[PDB]
Design a protein around this ligand. Structure first.
Ligand SMILES: [K+]
Ligand SMILES: [K+]
Lengths: 431, 431
């Protein structure tokens, strides 16, 4: 059984909705701005504590979903209107609603509902909610603790809320694999349709982890950009010589996957086929990839092997590259190993879109899969922002895209790597 | 491709190791004891705050892994060996080591290592570490924030630590589906072997969430047992008329899944075949199952369809039943709906082992899958503990097992349900 994409939905730092996000991405816009006190998510703390906490943050830049009741904005009054709904849940529901309406898949019949599942994972959940609860322990105010505390911090709950809203009674699932979360969630859902567990899967990733402890935590891991705090629009620079860590972003990407014959029967429009889901492990380090990028090589090779395609048949690669000194170079090295002559001749088009969106963490793999599907659909490959001085590994030919380029994209591959050395590679093709 | 089980490993409130856990389970033992101040995991808090917090907890019972350097005990010096290892990670590695040495699978060859993956999920991760970090905000001591904070709290990191320990470079994965986590992780891994993503998968679940905020959070939701604080060994009573909520437990279950031909070629000892992986969603309520238990019915029916077996061919069912008023009754109705004449004849053996182990949350689905496999392997069906007065739903010979029944077990099914209405049913058979 073959698996196709019939609906796209997203909410990103470039806007709410596929149209707005894609338009701004191609136009070369950037969703990164400087942090403020409000961004700490510390409404339950006094101003002196807020001020102190802000000062402890090495990284003072982030990529935010725009909130509001106007076009291209995320309306919290519509999507975060319940006590059990944390921000990551609202993003996923918002994106899922767009994807399902795009796919024209809102079944009323129990037969179809039972054959529709959900696989939308989150990477970390809601740290800010756990911080608020922990404050109750410190201040001896535990009576205030919400009965909805547990339900709103569980990383599988986006799938729960989506399935509930639409009555979807197929597999209720979530893959959680750090920054590969959105990729594995989509991939696992594909395997389920292939095996026959479902005919339709609403799959993707979500994350809303811009808050005091998240920023402080990633800053302590030395994972975040710090030296561009006065110039936020230049903070995320994948493949650039002056990159100094990623910029935390937030949002959700959700797609509607469905079995090919099922899609054709109902006359659904098809974006692309999902042809490869390559998985590997680095088996190296909790946070650092290996020098040779073997894990990334394995993941890409496995996705290729599944599709029955040769390296030279790949038109576009959306790289994971998060704007990290070691990470970006390792992936570049891995892309050279997998594609060799196809890459070193300049034939292969590749870019990282994280200069524009930031690192969406658990949602990164899903959002970037959407970008890859859209590359095929529109015949436009997105640029990498802020590559003023390309990494020494690159030359005149082997070079990431620095402008949005029109081209036939019949095949698009998207890499997502996470802490623990967990790797996924999703390969899409026109059908 | 067929998938078989070649290794078992576990760390539970009934002991470290399969040997001790199974022996104590079958002997009708219980791992539940009363909560103390030390169990709050509040080492960074003063005595006054410890006492306040303890007084605020309505549930004062939990099921603990026995620590120590003696047989049947968890040696924390061996497994909690670095600052990056939270308890859930340590339990998983301990369980994985046992499972792999049982499977006799410690390959040196890059080929075999690349064909071996890991799918061990955690449900919540490490709340206590987030609480400690949040305390640094309240006390303005963020200087002391651990560099390993982020790696410690991520629910996928058990898979990461296991893979790097043994150099496994196959799919590095985690399904996180609340209290179905262990089941979906095992089921997902099965699909991966079935498809050809891997030849061997180290799969299961892990949890260590006995701490101040976890107990407070679950207590506030009214999910936990409160009436039996004076008699802890009586607190978990699945299917009993006096049940009043579940008892939080901790531990890990890990199994080695293997492609059938791969197992036979190397002369591996085979416990059972995994024949069915049924998945569904309630699409009803964030925490409560629907009255008719349609989700449970669907999950069980789906696992049956996949196996090619009919209800009458099922020998043992390990119920999810957690000792909650609504939950247990709903599953009882669902079992009756699926098995009808096979249930009411008294020939279907079914029990919940949560009276003995407590609710292991993310590890529940994996530990109970192991019990289902061991039932087949040993020809003994485990009892339900503390059924003094069976629920009115049970009539005549439709009754859960209240003693360890010696019997031929050819087939065994295990149910796991989680918050968000996520349901999994795993079906094993002799081979
Ligand atoms: K990517
Ligand atoms: K079970």
């Amino acid at each position: 059984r073959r698996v196709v994409v019939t609906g796209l939905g997203m909410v990103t730092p470039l806007g709410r909705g596929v149209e707005t996000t894609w338009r701004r991405l191609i136009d070369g816009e950037c969703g990164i701005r400087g942090l403020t006190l409000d961004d700490l998510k510390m409404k339950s703390f006094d101003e002196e504590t807020k001020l102190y906490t802000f000062d402890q943050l090495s990284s003072k830049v982030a990529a935010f979903v725009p909130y509001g009741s106007n076009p291209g904005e995320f309306d919290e009054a519509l999507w975060l209107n319940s006590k059990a709904v944390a921000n990551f849940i609202g993003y996923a529901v918002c994106a899922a609603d767009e994807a399902l309406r795009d796919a024209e898949w809102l079944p009323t019949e129990e037969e179809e509902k039972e054959r529709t599942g959900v696989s939308i994972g989150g990477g970390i959940g809601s740290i800010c909610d756990i911080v608020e609860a922990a404050q109750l322990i410190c201040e001896k105010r535990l009576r205030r603790l919400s009965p909805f505390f547990i339900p709103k911090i569980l990383v599988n709950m986006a799938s729960g809320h989506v399935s509930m809203k639409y009555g979807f009674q197929g597999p209720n699932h979530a893959a959680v694999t750090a920054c590969a979360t959105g990729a594995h969630s989509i991939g696992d859902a594909t395997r389920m349709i292939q095996f026959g567990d479902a005919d339709v899967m609403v799959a993707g990733g979500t994350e809303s982890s811009i808050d005091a402890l998240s920023v402080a935590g990633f800053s302590r891991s030395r994972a975040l950009s710090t030296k561009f705090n006065s110039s936020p629009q230049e903070a995320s620079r994948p493949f650039d010589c002056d990159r100094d860590g990623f910029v935390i972003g937030e949002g959700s990407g959700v797609i509607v996957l469905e079995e090919y014959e099922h899609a054709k029967r109902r006359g659904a429009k098809i974006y692309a086929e999902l042809c490869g889901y390559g998985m590997s492990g680095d088996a190296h380090h909790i946070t650092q990839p290996p020098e040779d990028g073997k894990g990334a090589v394995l993941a890409m090779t496995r996705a290729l092997r599944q599709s029955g395609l040769c390296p030279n048949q790949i038109d576009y690669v959306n790289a994971h590259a998060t704007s990290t000194p070691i990470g970006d170079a390792v992936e570049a090295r891995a892309i050279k190993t997998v594609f060799s002559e196809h890459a070193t001749s300049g034939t292969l088009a590749f870019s990282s879109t994280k200069g524009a969106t930031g690192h969406l963490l658990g949602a990164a793999g899903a959002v970037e899969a959407i970008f890859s599907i859209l590359a095929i659909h529109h015949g436009v490959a997105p640029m990498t922002l802020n590559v003023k001085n390309p990494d020494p590994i690159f030359d005149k030919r082997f070079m990431p895209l620095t402008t949005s380029k029109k081209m036939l994209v019949r095949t698009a591959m998207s890499n997502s790597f996470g802490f623990g050395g967990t790797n996924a590679s999703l390969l899409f093709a026109s059908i």
